[PDB]
From Swiss-Prot, chain A:
The name this protein goes by in its record: Mediator of RNA polymerase II transcription subunit 23
Gene: Med23
Signal peptide: none
Role this protein plays: Component of the Mediator complex, a coactivator involved in the regulated transcription of nearly all RNA polymerase II-dependent genes. Mediator functions as a bridge to convey information from gene-specific regulatory proteins to the basal RNA polymerase II transcription machinery. Mediator is recruited to promoters by direct interactions with regulatory proteins and serves as a scaffold for the assembly of a functional pre-initiation complex with RNA polymerase II and the general transcription factors.
Organism of derivation: Mus musculus (Mouse)
Family under the similarity heading: Belongs to the Mediator complex subunit 23 family.
Cellular localization per UniProt: Nucleus
Subunit: Component of the Mediator complex, which is composed of MED1, MED4, MED6, MED7, MED8, MED9, MED10, MED11, MED12, MED13, MED13L, MED14, MED15, MED16, MED17, MED18, MED19, MED20, MED21, MED22, MED23, MED24, MED25, MED26, MED27, MED29, MED30, MED31, CCNC, CDK8 and CDC2L6/CDK11. The MED12, MED13, CCNC and CDK8 subunits form a distinct module termed the CDK8 module. Mediator containing the CDK8 module is less active than Mediator lacking this module in supporting transcriptional activation.
Swiss-Prot record, chain B:
Function: Component of the Mediator complex, a coactivator involved in the regulated transcription of nearly all RNA polymerase II-dependent genes. Mediator functions as a bridge to convey information from gene-specific regulatory proteins to the basal RNA polymerase II transcription machinery. Mediator is recruited to promoters by direct interactions with regulatory proteins and serves as a scaffold for the assembly of a functional preinitiation complex with RNA polymerase II and the general transcription factors. Required for RARA/RXRA-mediated transcription.
Residues of the full protein shown: 15 to 216 of 745
Subunit structure of this chain's protein: Component of the Mediator complex, which is composed of MED1, MED4, MED6, MED7, MED8, MED9, MED10, MED11, MED12, MED13, MED13L, MED14, MED15, MED16, MED17, MED18, MED19, MED20, MED21, MED22, MED23, MED24, MED25, MED26, MED27, MED29, MED30, MED31, CCNC, CDK8 and CDC2L6/CDK11. The MED12, MED13, CCNC and CDK8 subunits form a distinct module termed the CDK8 module. Mediator containing the CDK8 module is less active than Mediator lacking this module in supporting transcriptional activation.
Compartment annotation: Nucleus
Gene from which this protein is expressed: Med25
Annotated source species: Mus musculus
Family as reported in the entry's similarity comment: Belongs to the Mediator complex subunit 25 family.
Name of this protein: Mediator of RNA polymerase II transcription subunit 25
Coiled-coil stretches noted in the UniProt entry, renumbered to this chain: none
Curated annotation (Swiss-Prot), chain C:
Family as reported in the entry's similarity comment: Belongs to the Mediator complex subunit 24 family.
Tissue specificity statement from the Swiss-Prot or TrEMBL entry: Expressed in the adrenal gland, brain, epididymis, heart, kidney, liver, ovary, pancreas, prostate, skeletal muscle, small intestine, spleen, stomach, testis and thymus.
GO function terms (MF aspect): nuclear thyroid hormone receptor binding; transcription coactivator activity
Motif (LXXLL motif 5): 521-525
Section covered of the full-length record: 248 to 985 of 987
Location(s), subcellular: Nucleus
Any one GO CC term of the record: mediator complex
Name this protein carries in UniProt: Mediator of RNA polymerase II transcription subunit 24
From Swiss-Prot, chain D:
Gene field: Med16
Molecular function via GO: nuclear thyroid hormone receptor binding; transcription coactivator activity
Protein name: Mediator of RNA polymerase II transcription subunit 16
Task of the protein: Component of the Mediator complex, a coactivator involved in the regulated transcription of nearly all RNA polymerase II-dependent genes. Mediator functions as a bridge to convey information from gene-specific regulatory proteins to the basal RNA polymerase II transcription machinery. Mediator is recruited to promoters by direct interactions with regulatory proteins and serves as a scaffold for the assembly of a functional preinitiation complex with RNA polymerase II and the general transcription factors.
Gene Ontology BP annotations: positive regulation of DNA-templated transcription; positive regulation of transcription elongation by RNA polymerase II; positive regulation of transcription initiation by RNA polymerase II; RNA polymerase II preinitiation complex assembly; transcription by RNA polymerase II
The keyword Zinc-finger is assigned to this record: no
Location in the cell: Nucleus
Gene3D superfamilies: YVTN repeat-like/Quinoprotein amine dehydrogenase
Ranges that cross the membrane: none
SUPFAM superfamilies linked to this entry: Soluble quinoprotein glucose dehydrogenase (SSF50952), WD40 repeat-like (SSF50978)
Keywords: Activator, Nucleus, Repeat, Transcription, Transcription regulation, WD repeat
PROSITE patterns noted in UniProt: WD_REPEATS_2, WD_REPEATS_REGION
Length: 187, 192, 668, 738
């Protein structure tokens, strides 16, 4: 706030911090075993406490929440009760899309951690359907497709997406096969 | 197929004339050598081509050449068409030696031979009368011509403007078939 | 306390009490909460960071810090709650948080009995009249809830090693020192209690020097003497590799003598020390240089226990590495000769090996032939299958291996993965631990973002920051730290972060604070960008840190951290009591204070110096000392009237006649 | 003595303790002035009229270092590397307008400039002596390949290693601005505080130094830059380490050096110097291959890089920048020639600069009364030594200390020819002997232009004309200077007008035909036009481009040439001009006949500009040819032509431009300037009373508008975007119309 006023407003919000803290719960690690409300944001910010709570642990979006949500099938209901409602007219590609790109970016490590010991166990045998349903979530979200290109930019950082070329090609093929005819060619 | 090479020199002489030169001669370089008006994947198979640009040695403090077109994916060349630089003789031989060494490197490592052809473009009647005091080449423009045509079977060509330079007479040393007799008033030929 | 314990557990007789008094009186000073904080400190460590001998150092530091706070309570204050009932409610508050002792038991496995034992030991001079009852009542909660706990054995061996022998007589018990060295290195823990560290090291070095005595006559007698001297030399080398700074300090603290400390001090250190390898060690002992190697290859006689050229054996190793790789006279026959040369009681062998590792890392390094050669060659793997007169081919061998591992560690790190010849239990806990493929722009997240919520110093981060400072520069250090600090916008977090920032500055506090002030504060009040930056309420505690570090700097606190001793070499006029650096530093501070008070422009820096003057409420202070030499600031005090009892206090600079006059002026 | 600069509303910021400063430029426009007076912006100014100072705000803090790569506009912009290489070329070279070359340096201080373009040039002067070498045996050229010589294409960038970190610098930008960052923390561990050496024999860059005399490891990391595309996989080959000799010296071990720099040739030179307070020990080391003397020490790969010492020197000194930045060869037995090479300079922060010849360190001049470097091989320096709020001054630049006029002029001509062949700006005039010998100099120039050319002068004439002009500038013969300037402008005008022959295909070319047009009839150009040809000369219906710009210009020039003839007894031995060439007059005749053809085609011809065209250029051309037969070749000047030209018609205007440059004769005589506040006292016309447009200032006379309001005259604009003849000094003089 304005540099004219002294430390009075700072001490004010300080001495009222315990009031909001009385309404705090915890660090909000994760609460989402749903297979179908609480823990449901609107745009990167779920809470409602009108006072001034503590640092970004309550301000920053619960990215871990989205990461844990997208790791399971039938996750459509989560984002649906969150933001999915007439997506063809409302879901104009919010920022959360890039989030799953990070998930796809994590897919790189799925092929970078010794390629899961060169497909030692069922790691890839599960990641296949994981990325399958991940691309399945892409229904009205291909807008700002350069995010995937930014993913390529994100793939340039470290350049650990070498072995992931096959899997990334596979998921992009699922995507394009799902949207081959009706979609525009240049897109 | 899809093999070309550009060498622009007439900056000060064909500054404004370059637009008409492109509209009349540079269009078939893509319309014929490709499907039509050009975003495509870029590979090293040989379908790609090169483009070299050279300036006047006089209006240049220390820099000589700025050649940049290894592959260009057949579209990046279309990107930097208007991205040329401007600057009386020109001494273009030092720039023709650049294309010489470039096609030498091509034949050395990029040999999968698609007999890549090369075309020169000038507006001033240049001549590097001093053929000495250079870096890695000590030949004249006629020696370079007979080396790039006679010794190397690379198809050489020079597209002159409506005027009559001396290269139209220097063409007589083009031993390989260049097909530079008829002028490209119709769509340009792959061998000018 | 965390930083001090993690940096120098020795050579801390009583500067830490001075810094404690400083931070106490120059802050809110609740004695009960004070001892609560210090106890939470001495117990928050020892559990999370250490894994091996670092835990021994931790418990030794705790049991040295408790007499420190004891004598603090004895000498500091007397006349109001004389450290009797405050200690009672302190230990009660301690007993309140049971998970503390729960984690203590999870770590030490005997924290109940060891806790009671350390309590009754500290009660040697602490108060226990009506106090042990509450401790027992608390400890009775874990009745359900063990070969030998470390705290009790340290407390027991404390006096046993203090009055160890007190008489290094001739032909003393070699078996006694043998049993002392074969067991756990509790002597390091005893020296860490600072009770005899310097004195113990001095007597040890004296015994080591006496055990040379040139040569001997009897075969078995000279053999035993050489074995004992080599064991003692290796023990001294271990004491150096553990801390060194205090060891090398006590080696040449005072006196008038010149023994062979070069081979004992200039062997290795956390620095290069290798450019001088052609200068100092490369002597010319042409007599018996290679003849000693031939005699060692033959006899694996060794009766000549003149281990003075033993450090000079780098000269023989010259021709060794020559005929081995340079001249190529032998491939492994020379290796066999060197192996026979490093047979039992091979003490300086590790020294020459580290010296030649330094010579090779100073060499091309791209060859790496001699590097891996000396690595696999000087390895203590072979447990002396032959009749090597070592007698401790297991304990002494493992200690020699861990010594060679400790030194030249980062040197071998320069090459690829070394053969790893140590094969111990736990390696060095502290290390570089820096992401190579990552810039230094990391303290914001890996350090500052954590401590933003982490109300401690996180000893891992302690060593990380310590290594980061001497690897960079204090200027950009403080500049980056302050720049990242000016985004809190939460006064509680601001105060937390600024207190931690003052904390980290230790071991370099004087020069760090001086450069910080003299570089930021002029810029912090002269540029519009810095104006808008310091325009935040977080900026209030910046001057709080300023006055807090200024007094500690003006105090006669040496703080000679050997980790930063070699780095403290500058030259600056500071663009100007006496002609002292901190003196004219504070003088320039006063000048900038007056200038920021300049009229015709009321910027946020005006409020900044206003908060600074508000924070000048302190005791035994030096802010605007007002000395009779050239101290002008007092006049600027009149301008502060434009901004009261605080004026009456600040004007009270030195109770001078002119001081009284300006005090009266301000009084109206 | 002179060269008085100052500052208007700045100071030393007494509240601020200090700040290290720097400035360096290889080509012209030397000044950078990394200094925070009263952090702050960056400065730019040329050696000519330095008072016209320019500056531009930076995009960082504390402004650690900055350095250029080529003669073109490029700076470094350290402190996290924001504002890297970006040419300006917009209106002039006095406005940064930095492009997006921002290297991804997070919390770093990049201090290094690399990605070199070509092979250097040597100085085989004494082995040549300019006898008959024809500039070949004098300026040798080593044949090797610089780094990243990928694609024979020297890509440009700044792949380096910063000062704060020890990892890498990236974002080399050949036409694409590719970041291509990497990670190599100089063998996975280290700290540094020194600057970088440019390059070794092969393609490598090696530098490391951390603490000083106490801790003195000098590590080195051989590197290979260009391996893969779209990425950098720089290597970290450990090289032998080094130190400072002072560590073993029992005199004092408290040195702690802070410079440890060395020249660009990492062959045998290592110039680590001590930086005590309290001491100054300079040291030249060895970099050659050697072998260890490991033999005879017992019964009984030798090549080991043991970088030993070569020489040392113990004195007192504080700071310095460079010793001799261009470079001569070896086996130099030319002690008789005292060229400015193989030297060194030290600076006293509280004092002056001492220059001493290296490898002997015997004695030299003292130069009595935040480091300063040299301009070029010539003895030229700048006074950025800041004892507070101090500007820059000048000192004795005399490279040749003994008195030897013949040898002095020999060295002068050698350095001038080296500058010309390098295509650099020439500023050795500050070392000139008394201006009377200047003639002899330009005399030798003509020999160098003709005798030992041998045929290169065909392309060097344009540059050497302005060269010798600016040479005779600082000399009583300024009329010769402006005459040479007019010769230059007319020559380039003719050379740009000639290629306009867009003729139909004929038996010969228009160039050689217009050249042979000189061998034509005596008079009546209206007959010469039908003698040669009149049809194939039209090229555009919108030919109305030279009338308002060039036709009046050439007409005024030729008319002044006419009226100059009766001015034989002028206050000058050659008066205003010579008119003794004829060849230039032949070009003028070609111009007048072609514009006659133009008037026949386009009625927007060149009038007589006053009245009474009864056209009138006929008698003009007649008298020009009359003096032509007196000025073709091997002929003297005539008396009838005198009477014919003496009288004047009602068609004779005046007030010609005479494109020239303002003077700067401040050798040791006089300079009326300060740090700022220039006190006031064109080719395509556009020279009104007071400028009301962009009016892009230039080197000598142009000051032409930036847009020029052109429609098809773009040939001139596209021709003068780069430097001009005596027109590399493209200034941004404001439109302070009055």
């Amino acid at each position: 706030p304005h540099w004219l006023l002294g430390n009075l407003v700072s001490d004010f919000v300080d001495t009222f911090r315990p009031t909001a803290r009385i309404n705090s719960i915890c660090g909000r690690c994760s609460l989402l075993p749903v297979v179908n409300w609480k823990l449901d944001p609107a745009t990167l910010r779920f809470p409602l406490k009108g006072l001034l709570p503590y640092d970004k642990d309550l301000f920053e979006p619960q990215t871990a929440l989205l990461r844990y949500v997208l790791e399971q099938p039938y996750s459509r209901d989560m984002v649906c009760n969150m933001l999915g409602l007439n997506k063809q007219h409302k879901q104009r590609c919010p920022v959360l899309e890039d989030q799953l790109v990070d998930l796809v970016v994590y897919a790189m490590e799925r092929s970078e951690t010794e390629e899961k010991f060169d497909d030692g166990g069922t790691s890839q045998l599960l990641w296949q359907h994981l990325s399958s349903q991940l691309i399945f979530f892409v229904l009205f979200q291909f807008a700002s497709f350069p995010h995937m290109v930014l993913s390529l930019h994100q793939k340039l950082a470290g350049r650990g997406l070498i072995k992931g070329r096959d899997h990334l090609m596979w998921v992009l093929l699922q995507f394009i096969s799902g949207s081959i005819q009706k979609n525009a060619l240049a897109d | 197929v899809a093999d070309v090479v550009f060498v622009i020199e007439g900056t000060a002489n064909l500054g404004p004339y370059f637009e008409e030169l492109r509209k009349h001669y540079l269009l078939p370089a893509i319309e014929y050598f490709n499907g039509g008006p050009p975003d495509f994947g870029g590979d090293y198979g040989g379908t790609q081509y090169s483009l070299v640009v050279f300036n006047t040695v006089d209006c240049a403090p220390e820099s000589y050449v700025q050649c940049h077109a290894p592959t260009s994916s057949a579209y990046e060349f279309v990107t930097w068409l208007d991205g040329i630089k401007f600057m009386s003789c020109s001494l273009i031989a030092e720039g023709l030696s650049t294309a010489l060494q470039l096609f030498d490197d091509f034949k050395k490592m990029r040999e999968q031979q698609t007999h890549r052809v090369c075309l020169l473009i000038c507006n001033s009647p240049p001549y590097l009368l001093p053929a000495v005091e250079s870096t890695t080449y000590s030949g004249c423009t006629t020696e370079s011509l007979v080396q790039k045509i006679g010794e190397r079977g690379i198809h050489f060509s020079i597209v002159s403007p409506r005027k009559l330079p001396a290269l139209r007479l220097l063409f007589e040393k083009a031993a390989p078939p260049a097909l530079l007799e008829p002028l490209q008033q119709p769509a340009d030929v792959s061998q000018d | 306390i965390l930083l001090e314990g993690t940096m120098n557990l020795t050579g801390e007789m009583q500067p830490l009490v001075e810094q404690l008094m400083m931070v106490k009186r120059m802050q809110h000073i609740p004695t009960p909460l004070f001892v609560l904080e210090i106890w939470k400190a001495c117990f928050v460590g020892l559990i999370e960071s250490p894994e091996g001998t670092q835990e021994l150092k931790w418990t030794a530091f705790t049991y040295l810090k408790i007499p420190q706070v004891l004598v603090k309570l004895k000498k500091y204050f007397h006349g109001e709650k004389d450290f009797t009932e405050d200690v009672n409610c302190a230990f009660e508050f301690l007993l309140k948080l049971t998970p503390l002792l729960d984690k203590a038991d999870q770590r030490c496995n005997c924290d109940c009995t060891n806790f009671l034992l350390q309590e009754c030991n500290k009660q040697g001079l602490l108060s226990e009249v009506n106090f042990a009852s509450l401790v027992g009542k608390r400890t009775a909660d874990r009745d359900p809830q063990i070969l030998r706990a470390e705290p009790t054995v340290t407390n027991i061996l404390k006096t046993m090693d203090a009055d160890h022998s007190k008489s290094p007589e001739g032909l003393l018990g070699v078996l006694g020192h043998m049993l002392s060295g074969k067991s756990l290195d509790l002597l390091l823990a005893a020296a860490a209690a600072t009770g005899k560290l310097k004195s113990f090291a001095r007597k040890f070095i004296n015994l080591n020097e006496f055990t040379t005595h040139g040569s001997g006559e009897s075969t078995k007698t000279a053999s035993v003497r050489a074995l004992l001297f080599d064991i003692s030399f290796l023990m001294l080398c271990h004491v150096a590799q553990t801390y060194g700074s205090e060891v090398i300090l006590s080696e040449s603290s005072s006196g008038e003598e010149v023994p062979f400390f070069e081979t004992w001090m200039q062997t290795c250190m956390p620095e290069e020390g290798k450019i001088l390898n052609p200068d100092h060690p490369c002597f010319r002992p042409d007599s018996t240089k290679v003849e000693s190697l031939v005699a060692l290859l033959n006899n694996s006689k060794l009766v000549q226990m003149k281990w003075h050229e033993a450090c000079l054996s780098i000269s023989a190793a010259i021709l060794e590495i020559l005929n081995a790789w340079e001249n190529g006279v032998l491939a492994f026959e020379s290796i066999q000769k060197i192996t026979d040369n490093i047979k039992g009681k091979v003490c300086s062998l590790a020294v020459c090996a580290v010296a030649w590792l330094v010579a090779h890392v100073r060499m091309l390094g791209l060859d790496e032939r001699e590097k891996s050669l000396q690595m696999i060659r000087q390895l203590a793997g072979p447990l002396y299958s032959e009749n090597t007169l070592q007698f401790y081919n297991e304990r002494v061998v493992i200690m020699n291996s861990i010594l060679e591992h400790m030194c030249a560690d980062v040197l071998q790190q320069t090459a690829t993965q070394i053969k790893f010849p140590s094969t111990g239990v736990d390696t060095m806990p502290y290390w570089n631990l820096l992401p190579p493929k990552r810039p230094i722009k990391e303290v914001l997240t890996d350090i500052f973002a954590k401590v933003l919520e982490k109300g401690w110093v996180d000893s891992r981060s302690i060593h990380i920051l310590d290594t980061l400072l001497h690897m960079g520069g204090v200027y950009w250090f403080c500049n980056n730290l302050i720049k990242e600090l000016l985004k809190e916008t939460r006064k509680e977090h601001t105060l937390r972060a600024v207190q931690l920032l003052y904390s980290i500055f230790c071991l370099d506090m004087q020069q760090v604070t001086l450069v910080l002030l003299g570089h930021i504060l002029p810029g912090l009040l002269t540029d519009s960008s810095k104006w808008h930056s310091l325009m935040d309420p977080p900026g209030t505690a910046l001057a709080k840190l300023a006055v807090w570090c200024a007094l500690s700097s003006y105090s006669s606190h040496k703080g000679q951290a050997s980790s930063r001793q070699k780095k403290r070499h500058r030259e600056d006029i500071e663009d100007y009591n006496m002609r002292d650096p901190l003196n004219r530093v504070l003088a320039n501070l006063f000048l900038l204070i007056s200038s920021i008070l300049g009229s015709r422009t009321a910027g946020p820096h005006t409020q900044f110096v206003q908060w600074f003057m508000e924070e000048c409420v302190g005791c035994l202070e030096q802010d605007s000392r007002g000395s009779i030499l050239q101290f002008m600031p007092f006049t600027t005090v009149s301008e502060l009237v434009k901004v009261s009892p605080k004026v009456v206090l600040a004007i009270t600079d030195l109770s001078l006649p002119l001081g009284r006059q300006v005090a009266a002026k301000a009084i109206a | 003595l002179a060269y008085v600069c100052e500052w208007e509303k700045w100071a030393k910021s007494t509240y601020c303790p200090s700040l290290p400063l720097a400035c360096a430029w290889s080509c012209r426009n030397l000044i950078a002035f990394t200094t925070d007076l009263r952090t702050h912006m960056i400065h730019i100014l040329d050696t000519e009229h330095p008072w016209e100072v320019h500056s531009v705000s930076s995009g960082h803090s504390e402004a650690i270092t900055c350095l250029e790569w080529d003669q073109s506009g490029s700076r470094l912009l350290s402190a996290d590397a924001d504002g890297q290489i970006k040419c300006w070329s917009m209106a002039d070279h006095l406005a940064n307008s930095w492009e997006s070359s921002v290297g991804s340096q997070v919390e770093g201080d990049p201090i290094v400039a690399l990605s070199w373009l070509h092979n250097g040039v040597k100085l085989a002067l004494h082995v040549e002596k300019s006898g008959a070498s024809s500039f070949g045996e004098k300026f040798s050229r080593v044949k090797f390949s610089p780094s990243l010589t990928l694609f024979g294409k020297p890509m440009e960038g700044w792949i380096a290693v910063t000062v704060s970190g020890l990892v890498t610098v990236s974002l080399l930008k050949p036409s694409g601005q590719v970041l291509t960052s990497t990670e190599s923390l100089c063998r996975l561990r280290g700290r540094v505080a020194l600057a970088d050496i440019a390059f070794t024999g092969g393609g490598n860059i090696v530098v490391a130094a951390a603490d000083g005399s106490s801790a003195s490891p000098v590590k080195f990391y051989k590197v290979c830059v260009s391996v893969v595309s779209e990425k950098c996989r720089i290597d970290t080959e450990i090289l032998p380490s080094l130190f400072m000799r002072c560590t073993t010296d029992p005199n004092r071990k408290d040195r702690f050096p802070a410079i440890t720099h060395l020249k660009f040739l990492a062959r045998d030179m290592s110039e680590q110097v001590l930086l005590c307070a309290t001491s100054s020990l300079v040291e030249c080391w060895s970099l050659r291959k050697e072998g260890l003397p490991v033999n005879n020490i017992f019964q009984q790969q030798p090549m080991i890089l043991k970088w030993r010492i070569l020489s040392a020197t113990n004195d007192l000194d504080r700071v310095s920048a460079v010793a001799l930045p261009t470079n001569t060869d070896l086996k130099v037995a030319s002690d008789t020639q005292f060229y400015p090479g193989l030297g060194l300079a030290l600076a006293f922060q509280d004092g002056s600069v001492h220059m001493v010849h290296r490898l002997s360190l015997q004695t030299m001049a003292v130069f009595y009364s935040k480091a300063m470097q040299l301009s070029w091989t010539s003895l030229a320096l700048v006074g950025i030594d800041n004892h507070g709020k101090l500007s820059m001054l000048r000192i004795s630049p005399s490279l040749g200390h003994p008195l030897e006029p013949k040898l002095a002029l020999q060295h002068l001509l050698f350095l001038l020819e080296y500058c010309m062949v390098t295509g650099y700006d020439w500023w050795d005039i500050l070392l000139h002997v008394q201006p009377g010998m200047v003639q002899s100099l330009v005399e030798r120039l003509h020999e160098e232009y003709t005798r030992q050319k041998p045929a290169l002068q065909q392309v060097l004439s344009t540059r050497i004309l302005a060269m010798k002009a600016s040479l005779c500038k600082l000399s009583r013969v300024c009329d010769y200077h402006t005459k040479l300037f007019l010769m230059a402008i007319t020559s380039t005008l003719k050379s740009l007008l000639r290629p306009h022959f867009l003729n139909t295909p004929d038996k010969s070319p228009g160039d050689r035909l217009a050249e042979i047009c000189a061998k034509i009839t005596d008079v009546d150009i209206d007959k010469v036009m039908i003698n040669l040809k009149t049809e194939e000369f039209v090229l555009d219906m919108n030919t109305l481009q030279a009338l308002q710009q060039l036709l009046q210009w050439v007409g005024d020039f030729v008319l002044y040439l006419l009226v100059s003839l009766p001015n034989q007894g002028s206050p000058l031995r050659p008066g205003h001009s010579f008119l003794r060439d004829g060849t230039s007059l032949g070009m003028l005749r070609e111009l007048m006949v072609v514009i006659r053809i133009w008037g026949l085609l386009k009625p927007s011809c060149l009038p007589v500009y006053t009245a009474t065209s009864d056209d009138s250029m006929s008698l003009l051309f007649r008298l020009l040819t009359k003096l032509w037969i007196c000025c073709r070749d091997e002929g003297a000047a005539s008396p009838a032509s005198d009477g014919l030209v003496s009288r004047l018609q009602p068609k004779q205007p005046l007030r010609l431009r005479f494109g020239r440059a303002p003077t700067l004769p401040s050798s040791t005589s006089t300079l009326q300037l300060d740090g700022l506040t220039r006190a006031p006292g064109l080719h395509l016309g556009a020279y009104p009373t007071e400028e009301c447009k962009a009016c892009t200032r230039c080197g000598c006379v142009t000051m032409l508008k930036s847009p020029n309001k052109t429609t098809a005259v773009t040939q001139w604009e596209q021709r003068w975007i780069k430097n001009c003849l005596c027109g590399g000094l493209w200034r941004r003089v404001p439109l302070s119309c009055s």
